[PDB]
């Protein structure tokens, strides 16, 4: 039942959305025209996949999703592409002029012209739900729309849906693929503004994904297409418990109980395995032990940081495919007797396990080998704060000279907003230090 509405904001949010929804269709046997032969209840139902897809009387399975961007060219590709029939046109929303890598334009100058229309479209999706659970919001930190429009939208969703859950998948900037010098300003501004409005946020460091593609898939120079296919496998792992049933399946909301010890401490670290090429996977079966071991290898993390140099407040293992508890328990025991896994003194140390039996899927033409079993670890580690420290320092370097600040002030913002946001980030860093200190 419990429906989830996905909102894909700006270029990164939209292109990652493309990859996710394509992958979901393949996992569920939904064709590009939205038909699903295996679904025998026409025009509706309460199957697990219905959390993410509504149905029309003509048998179309329609994503519960809105795609929004302030310029039209990325969403235009969706409108004209392979899955164009999947979406009702009103779910794909564009303006004419983008935010120009400026949070201020995304939140105020341009964003304000389209925010009411976007809310109207989201309301139309919500009115079709019988038990809406919440929202999943996909966006970059660095873009003007991804940063500024997302913030505005999150603020408005708090007002219109109260404390209905809002989760983010947030794309953290990397120099190898970034397109604006001001991305650190945009990141801090949006992180500050969204913090009280988000229940849980999964950061995806483009640099971490870039190096996984280069190192584990032998891709010379990863493109967004390469990055997004990997990201979608990870998002799929996280949402699989919402979209599939199963005796050993554990709901994402139940993992969230363990992952969020205080409202602001809501940024889990995801680590995914196995990421391997067809050439390397051939004749090589990677066992539960092997993929579990890989979750404690920092090179497989979706955010660059070193958990061996922090403390854990939760560890969750989300398995999919050919996996049974006996083998998981054995792998965990081995890891316990060999790894730098130290918990804070106020949290239990047991790992929380879920298993979804539906095996992983890959998109044709992709880089990942098709495997029989995979795992996503979600941990709450103080180490994730290193990501904020890196961004915060870049912010400080430029802000000390007020470099580029006139672009924001010109669009109506005040320096006071910059210092407020940065102070909130300094407080968040301190929060992460404090939770790690032993109890008196």
């Amino acid at each position: 039942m419990r429906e989830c509405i996905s909102i894909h904001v700006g270029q990164a949010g939209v292109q990652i959305g493309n990859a996710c929804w394509e992958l979901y269709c393949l996992e569920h046997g939904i064709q590009p025209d939205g038909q699903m032969p295996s679904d025998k209840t026409i025009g509706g139902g309460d199957d697990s996949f219905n959390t993410f897809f509504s149905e029309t009387g003509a048998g179309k399975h329609v994503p519960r999703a809105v795609f929004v961007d302030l310029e039209p060219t990325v969403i235009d590709e969706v409108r004209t592409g392979t899955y164009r029939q999947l979406f009702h046109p009103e779910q794909l929303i564009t303006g004419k002029e983008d935010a120009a890598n400026n949070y201020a334009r995304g939140h105020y100058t341009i964003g304000k012209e389209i925010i009411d229309l976007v809310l109207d479209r989201i309301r139309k999706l919500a009115d079709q739900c019988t038990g809406l659970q919440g929202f999943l919001v996909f966006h970059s930190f660095g873009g003007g729309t991804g940063s500024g429009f997302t913030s505005l939208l999150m603020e408005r969703l708090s007002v219109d849906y109260g404390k209905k859950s809002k989760l983010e998948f947030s794309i953290y900037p990397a120099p190898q693929v970034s397109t604006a010098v001001v991305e650190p300003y945009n990141s801090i501004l949006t992180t500050h503004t969204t913090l009280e409005h988000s229940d849980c946020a999964f950061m995806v460091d483009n640099e971490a994904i870039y190096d996984i593609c280069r190192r584990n898939l032998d891709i010379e120079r990863p493109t967004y297409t390469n990055l997004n296919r990997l990201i979608s496998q990870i998002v799929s792992s996280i949402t699989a418990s919402l979209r599939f049933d199963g005796a050993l399946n554990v709901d994402l909301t139940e993992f969230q109980t363990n992952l969020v010890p205080y409202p602001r401490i809501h940024f889990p670290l995801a680590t995914y395995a196995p990421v391997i090429s067809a050439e390397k996977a051939y004749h090589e079966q990677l066992s539960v032990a092997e993929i579990t071991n890989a979750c404690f290898e920092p090179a497989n993390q979706m955010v660059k940081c070193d958990p061996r140099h922090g403390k854990y407040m939760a560890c969750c293992l989300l398995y999919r495919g050919d996996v049974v508890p006996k083998d998981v328990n054995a792998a965990i025991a081995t890891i316990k007797t060999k790894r730098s896994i130290q918990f804070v003194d106020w949290c239990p140390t047991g790992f929380k396990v879920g298993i979804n039996y539906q095996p992983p899927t890959v998109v044709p033409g992709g880089d990942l080998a098709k495997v029989q079993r995979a795992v996503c670890m979600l941990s709450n580690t103080t180490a994730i704060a290193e990501a904020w420290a890196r961004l915060d320092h870049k912010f400080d370097l430029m802000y000390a000279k007020r470099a580029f600040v006139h672009w924001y002030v010109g669009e109506g913002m005040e320096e006071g907003e910059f210092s407020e946001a940065r102070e909130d980030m300094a407080a968040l860093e301190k929060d992460y230090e404090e939770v790690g200190v032993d109890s008196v």
């Binding site: 039942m1 909301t253 139940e254 109980t257 508890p325 006996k326 003194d345 239990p348 047991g350």
Partner: protein, 420 residues
């Protein structure tokens, strides 16, 4: 003292309750369609304690199934004996309780509870002489724990002169779903101290250890745990369900087992548990490895004990062996309650066994269980960890402080009689 009304709440509560009904249905010769096909008159003599009769000699469990989400009860309804329950007695919401006592007790549960009481009232109304209620639930989740204890309070308000009995599954970090279990269990235990007459304390750690250490199950499932619980619940209710002299109703049991109103938390045990003579049965039933609260009986004293033997066996030998246990370990039975062990025997053995025994002990050692929960509670509460899940439902920290104090008081009251 005839009818008992059974309530099962939340995931654990419904999963164990379903198994309980399958097991005693089999024992009473009732098939999944509610038809009787037994060969002994003992089967029907007291069948009305747990079952109503319907047209066509049909028997229907006096059972109410409660949950804040549909999943587990959908599974029950699809289960083996699922069609035996009264369809109108499935009472459920859609939103779930998120493993959150506050959601079960104050918000989500509050919205559903009147409709549960309506069904309870309908069942109670067709009782010639209602003894009281039995509730199955866990203390570590949201619905069984929070809503289950809310129900108990409202039932007591409406039926204050009836007995309230619970089978209450206590959480353990070794067999755990979430980190907030100790908060949910602490909040619940205070409700149970006040509003139940008899609570069977079933520790998931004990169940796990029996499955793994004793039964040699390498990887126990909740299903394996529930098989043990099933068997135990059948054993402890034998005296209510069949002709007999001792502990034949919930009040007489309470009067025999509860010398001080708050100390009504029992350790149950079962024998045999194997990977059988009367002596062996008797030794195994008093064996700590056969008990289900993860407390060492030698770390305390027995205030009262009920033993129930099942199968065809020499009552002479039963009496002899029970005397031998008390006379040879007399220090573990408080001397200021003379003759505090009572024994019953029922000729009808459980399925698959020629003889069995069930143990119900009121032991001061049970304080160890409350101590473990108290420690786990404090480890988190000292840092106010995970409390936003509860404050978001309107609770304040002071309610946690009070529950913790209440449970520490319970622990202190046991210890007092341990040194008495």
């Amino acid at each position: 003292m005839r009818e008992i009304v059974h309530i099962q709440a939340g995931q654990c509560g419904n999963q164990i309750g379903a198994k309980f009904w399958e097991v005693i249905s089999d024992e009473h010769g009732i098939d999944p369609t509610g038809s009787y096909h037994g060969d002994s008159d003992l089967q029907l003599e007291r069948i009305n304690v747990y079952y109503n009769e319907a047209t066509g000699n049909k028997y229907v469990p006096r059972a109410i199934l409660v949950d804040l989400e549909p999943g587990t009860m959908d599974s029950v309804r699809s289960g083996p004996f699922g069609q035996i329950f009264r369809p109108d007695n499935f009472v459920f919401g859609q939103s779930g309780a998120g493993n959150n006592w506050a959601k079960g007790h104050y918000t989500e549960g509050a919205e559903l509870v009147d409709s549960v009481l309506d069904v309870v009232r309908k069942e109670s109304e067709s009782c010639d002489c209602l003894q009281g209620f039995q509730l199955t639930h866990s203390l570590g989740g949201g619905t069984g724990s929070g809503m289950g204890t809310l129900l108990i309070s409202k039932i007591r308000e409406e039926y204050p002169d009836r007995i309230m009995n619970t089978f209450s599954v206590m959480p353990s970090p070794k067999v755990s779903d979430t980190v907030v279990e100790p908060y949910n269990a602490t909040l619940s235990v205070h409700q149970l101290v006040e509003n139940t007459d008899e609570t069977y304390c079933i520790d998931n750690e004990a169940l796990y250890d029996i499955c793994f250490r004793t039964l040699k199950l390498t990887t126990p499932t909740y299903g394996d745990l529930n098989h043990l619980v099933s068997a135990t619940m059948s054993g402890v209710t034998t005296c209510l369900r069949f002709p007999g002299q001792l502990n034949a109703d919930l009040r007489k049991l309470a009067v025999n087992m509860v010398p001080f109103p708050r100390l009504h938390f029992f350790m149950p045990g079962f024998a045999p548990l194997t990977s059988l003579t009367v002596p062996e049965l008797t030794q195994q039933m008093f064996d700590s490895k056969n008990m289900m609260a993860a407390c060492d009986p030698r770390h305390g004293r027995y205030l009262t004990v009920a033993a129930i033997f099942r199968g065809r066996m020499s009552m002479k030998e039963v009496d002899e062996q029970m005397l031998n246990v008390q006379n040879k370990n007399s220090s573990y039975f408080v001397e200021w309650i003379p003759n505090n062990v009572k024994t019953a025997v029922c000729d009808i053995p459980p399925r698959g066994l020629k003889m069995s025994a069930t143990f119900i002990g009121n032991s001061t050692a049970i304080q160890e269980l409350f101590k473990r929960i108290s420690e786990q509670f404090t480890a988190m509460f000292r840092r106010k960890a995970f409390l936003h899940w509860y404050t978001g439902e309107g609770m304040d920290e002071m309610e946690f402080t009070e529950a913790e104090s209440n449970m520490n008081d319970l622990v202190s009251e046991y210890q007092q009689y341990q040194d008495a």
